[PDB]
Amino acid sequence: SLLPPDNEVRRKHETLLLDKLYDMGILSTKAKLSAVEHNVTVSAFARRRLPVVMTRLRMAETVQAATKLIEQGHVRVGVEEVRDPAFLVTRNMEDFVTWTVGSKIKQNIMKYRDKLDDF
Amino acid sequence: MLRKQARQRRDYLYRRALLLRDAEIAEKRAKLRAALASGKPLDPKIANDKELRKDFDYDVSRDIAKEQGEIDIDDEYSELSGIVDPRVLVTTSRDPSSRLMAFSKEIRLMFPTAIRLNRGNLILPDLVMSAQRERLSDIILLHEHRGTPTAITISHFPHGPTLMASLHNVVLRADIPKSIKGTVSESYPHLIFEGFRTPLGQRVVKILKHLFPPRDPTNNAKSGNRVITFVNQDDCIEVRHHVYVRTNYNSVELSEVGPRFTMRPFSITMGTLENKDADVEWHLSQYTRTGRKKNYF
Amino acid sequence: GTPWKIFKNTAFIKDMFNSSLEIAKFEGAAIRTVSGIRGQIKRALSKPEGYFRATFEDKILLSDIVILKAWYPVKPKQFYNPATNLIGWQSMRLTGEIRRAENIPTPQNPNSTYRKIERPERHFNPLRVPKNLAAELPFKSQIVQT
Amino acid sequence: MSSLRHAIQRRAHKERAQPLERQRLGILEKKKDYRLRARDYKKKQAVLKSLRQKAAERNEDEFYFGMMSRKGPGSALTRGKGFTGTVDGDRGNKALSVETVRLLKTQD
Amino acid sequence: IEELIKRRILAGEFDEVLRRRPDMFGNPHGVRRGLVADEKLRRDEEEIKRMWKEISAKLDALSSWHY
Amino acid sequence: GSQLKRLKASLREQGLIGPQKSKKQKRQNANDQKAEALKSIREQFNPFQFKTNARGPKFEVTTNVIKGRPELSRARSEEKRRQ
RNA sequence: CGCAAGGCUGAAAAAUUGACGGAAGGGCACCACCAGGGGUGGAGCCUGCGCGCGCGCUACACUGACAGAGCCAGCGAGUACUCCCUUGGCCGAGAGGCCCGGGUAAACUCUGUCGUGCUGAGGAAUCCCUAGUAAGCGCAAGUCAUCAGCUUGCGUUGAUUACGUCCCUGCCCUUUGUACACACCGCCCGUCGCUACUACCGAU
């Protein structure tokens, strides 16, 4: 902000900062620097954490149950199992968080949907 | 992959709604910047908003960049505008006729980078699935009445708009003999658009000119020998496809090489071909009182 | 006219015209339902001679009546009696005097005379969710029917 | 205004009925009955469009804890001929132990 | 329509989208990759470049190298 | 061949598009038609003005191919309706 | 309101950067070759386009007819849907309502009975087509444009032959650029323009 408004490096680093924060999912728009004024927030980081983002994705029911499930280790993010309940899930890894391989929670979901393939 | 398409479409719709609210605020912020430079007194409801001034000090620069045109608007085409060659497949309805298949070939040859696909027994969600699975930019569906085509459906992918249009006055390439016609040249075509002035007209201009691969801008004003013309009167966009030689610096000889349409659009939906429940952006309002008087595009 | 087959929008309308020549003259005309549904005459129908296809605004019912409001010109008659009273003159009578003299009743249509309409209260069917959609939608919004 | 109109200005216009040669088809739907029909159809289509959005944007790995105390909608193959997409609910009955049925049958 | 085409071709203005360079942002001059007061404002710009190097390293390391 | 290539070849044959001749070549041309051929070129290379079949005649009889002009016929019919 | 709003007049260039080619070498193409398949074109019906033309539809027999047995789908639910018009009679002062007459598949599999019998699969051309593709089959819908003389979905059964090459027909492009190591190549060719200078020719 304190740079002059027609500055090239100001414009380039505004677009870089907004694109970085929108790719990490903290901001919901990438067209205002007042988003980084009063919308970037430790609560925005803490809701980009893993048990809250799988509460939102409805992998669990509540953030307490989600922290219990990812402490017991049913949740992988991508291809690697995640035991840390503070792993910050970015906007393009929210498409890859899912259950682990031999999960009893996955067997519970398939047994509910009556698609329990035992092979 | 499918979760990524759904997530990116939802993020796009949320960003568009936030842009609506931010435009409602930024119409007020552009009065504060113009009053600061010119010294004309402004409204008290604008000059006495502390949040507006406090955030204006950070958000000057994007308004200046939009005034200079240095940035581009959040759009489904602005992500890959002149970077990727848009690949596009043309398909028929389910059981095509021979003249519909030859017409599908003709409007495949209209685009230099298109491919044609045989429908046969191909369910339409799996058609959309295979398009997103092979990263196609556009699909175009064709519908015939009885050996004569009556509808196009131009759908942009991954989640872009459909333009459904009905065709009239179709004169096929496959009616004239091979002694008079020939193999159409496949060079990157120039495009001209005539008569689009509303923002809806610029919308249909965008979703029609992002079907063609981008022209090399070094010497494009004189090189290239093939032109495609979209000109609308009474919101029925009429399209010709010519090939030309510049027989002098003052004169040019045209030669009609492709099919002639006068397509009329009747539906522009912000959502792909599978979504029948997508939110429409415009539709041809028949059976209203002044829907025949009012001209869009 | 009267609807014959009723699809979602396009309805076939029967007792209005007599031939495809008359329909081809009245092609594109603004047809209307009694209820208020607008529509347009689209195409003459081949196999029953005198029917046509008209695409309406929403779905019309078989009880509905489909009208087309044309404007036919009426020319006045060129009659002129002078009222030469001191000589004598023939006075043309009125329609009531003509009917009472030559004994013909006034034309009265029972379909035209106003009646009281017994409207039952319109109750509609409940929502009928399809099986595949009702099996595909998620757990928080799954339908629970004993 | 309202005082610049006669009683014949105020007089109501009557509604025509269905013709008597066509009264078996039901009532003649006018603007009011058509408005009721259109309201009911737009409401049902709004609910169905929201259900189609919810069935499209469904996480395939979701896990609620009612799934361990409910029977799912299944498929036509797993359920059978008696397959509706509705999750079956409980009528309140329960399998009853032998001592309590001994008590009930002594009473009967 | 034919005369409109001839006018555009002669006084050639075409509405085709043009091929832009994919690195117009970071490399605006388009250099070739082979053989080759105001001091207050320059000091402020270099301070913002230093701050952004530190902050981009922290944000990529906090998103755990998915960026 | 292509329509572009055959258009260029016919205009090179008619001498409308060829290389810039010198004054000596113009002397040879003034030492030693083309509108009548340009009319045929502008009719042949714009084949959509008139309606043609592609197959040709079904049964060949030898005895001594534009079959209709829809644009001119529609304009003529609209003038009749105007009158 | 002021300017615009006064007719040497009477319809049909730029270039030190330009104009057009040729030869060599590449890339691609069911508008190319190669191997096959399928339409249309023969008879009848009809939308449409301008008597003609195709696009669909139907009939044309070994892939047969008759009688049985068994066994398979998917999309589809607006108090909403109905094919006519009539001979009579009922109850109808009259308008009507009644009654009786006249005009969830196809396919497939198995088992038997009879046996080519006006009871004949489309010429020259021309076009299209490479995997759940060609082709057969039915079921459903009728979504503000188009479409009932049909349209669009949806399932079912599911092959032959290419999947190489630029030889033919063409299309695009290199011979300037756009990156640097290894490694390789080694001044493509023609007809004119334009500019600068030099001298020539002959009238004023």
Q: What is the DSSP string of chain A?
A: --S-TT-HHHHHHHHHHHHHHHHHTS-S-SS-SHHHHHT--HHHHHHSSHHHHHHHTTSSSSHHHHHHHHHHT-EEETTEE---TT----TTTTTTEEE-TT-HHHHHHHHHHT-----
Instruction: Determine the protein residue whose CA lies at the shortest distance from the C1' of G171.
Output: B185
Resolution expressed in Å: 3.5
C1' nearest to CA of B266: which nucleotide?
G145
Instruction: Determine the protein residue whose CA lies at the shortest distance from the C1' of G46.
Output: C46
Of E29, E30, E23, E22, nearest to B83 (Cα)?
E22
Residues forming beta bridges with residue B140, ordered by sequence position: B90, B154
CA B94 to chain centre: 25
Rounded to whole angstroms, the Cα distance separating B207 from B196 reads 13
- CA B173 / C1′ G35 distance in Å: 29
Inter-residue contact B188 to B215 (CB < 8 Å): yes
Cβ contacts from B onto E, under 8 A: 75
Rounded to whole angstroms, the Cα distance separating D48 from C141 reads 12
- Quick check: B220 CB within 7 A of strand G? no
Of B234, B239, B271, nearest to B258 (Cα)?
B239
Inter-residue contact A39 to B66 (CB < 8 Å): no
Residue F48 parent element (H or E): none
Q: Is B10 on the interface with D (CB under 8 A)?
A: yes
CA B276 to chain centre: 19
Rounded to whole angstroms, the Cα distance separating A69 from A108 reads 13
Q: How buried is residue B105: exposed, middle or buried, by Cβ count under 10 Å (0-12/13-18/19+)?
A: middle
Rounded to whole angstroms, the Cα distance separating A81 from F46 reads 67
- Residue B139 dihedral angles phi and psi, to the nearest 5°: -115, 150
Strands (E) in chain C, as ranges, are 3-6, 10-13, 30-33, 38-44, 52-56, 66-67
**CB within 8 A of B173, min separation 6: which ones?**
B102, B103, B106, B109, B181, B184, B258, B259
Rounded to whole angstroms, the Cα distance separating A9 from D18 reads 78
Amino acid letter for position B56:
F
Rounded to whole angstroms, the Cα distance separating C92 from C83 reads 11
Protein footprint on strand G: which nucleotides are under 7 Å from a CB? 13-14, 18-21, 31-32, 38-42, 47-50, 52-56, 74-85, 94-98, 123-137, 141-158, 169-173, 177-180, 190-193
Rounded to whole angstroms, the Cα distance separating B91 from B154 reads 11
Inter-residue contact B29 to B59 (CB < 8 Å): yes
Rounded to whole angstroms, the Cα distance separating E16 from B223 reads 13
Rounded to whole angstroms, the Cα distance separating C118 from D85 reads 40
Q: Are strands B88-91 and B114-116 parallel, antiparallel or unpaired?
A: parallel
Amino acid letter for position B28:
K
Strands (E) in B136-284, as ranges, are 138-144, 149-156, 162-166, 190-194, 226-233, 236-245, 253-256, 261-269, 280-283
CB < 8 Å to A60, chain D: 63
CB < 8 Å to A58, chain C: 138, 140
Inter-residue contact C88 to C96 (CB < 8 Å): no
- Quick check: F33 CB within 7 A of strand G? no
Please give the method by which this entry was determined.
cryo-EM
- CA B115 / C1′ G165 distance in Å: 22
Token pair belonging to D66: 């009612």
Q: Which 3 state secondary structure label does DSSP give B54?
A: helix
Inter-residue contact B211 to B138 (CB < 8 Å): yes
Q: Please count the other Cβ atoms lying within 10 Å of the Cβ belonging to residue F71.
A: 11
| Cβ–Cβ below 8 Å for B253 and F42 | yes
| Cβ–Cβ below 8 Å for A7 and E45 | yes
Token pair belonging to D77: 């193959």
Rounded to whole angstroms, the Cα distance separating B274 from B278 reads 9
| Cβ–Cβ below 8 Å for B227 and E9 | yes
* Residue burial F26-43, b: 16+ Cβ < 10 Å; e: rest: eeeeeeeeeeeebeebee
- Residue F22 dihedral angles phi and psi, to the nearest 5°: -80, 175
Q: Is B4 on the interface with D (CB under 8 A)?
A: no
Q: C-alpha angle B151/B153/B154, rounded to 5°?
A: 135
Q: C-alpha angle B139/B257/B157, rounded to 5°?
A: 10
Closest chain B residue to the Cα of C54, Cα to Cα: B287
Token pair belonging to A116: 């329990």
Rounded to whole angstroms, the Cα distance separating B194 from E7 reads 12
| Cβ–Cβ below 8 Å for A92 and E52 | no
Q: Are strands C52-56 and C10-13 parallel, antiparallel or unpaired?
A: antiparallel
Q: Which of residues 50-89 of D touch strand G (CB under 7 A)?
A: 76
- Quick check: E12 CB within 7 A of strand G? no
Residues forming beta bridges with residue B238, ordered by sequence position: B231, B262
Breaks in chain F (C–N beyond 2.5 Å) sit after 32, 64
Residue count of chain D, please give it. 108
Rounded to whole angstroms, the Cα distance separating B284 from B234 reads 12
Inter-residue contact C131 to C145 (CB < 8 Å): no
Cβ contacts from A onto C, under 8 A: 3
Inter-residue contact D73 to C134 (CB < 8 Å): yes
| Cβ–Cβ below 8 Å for E12 and B189 | no
Inter-residue contact B82 to B214 (CB < 8 Å): yes
Of B5, B12, B10, nearest to B129 (Cα)?
B5
**CB within 8 A of C125, min separation 6: which ones?**
none
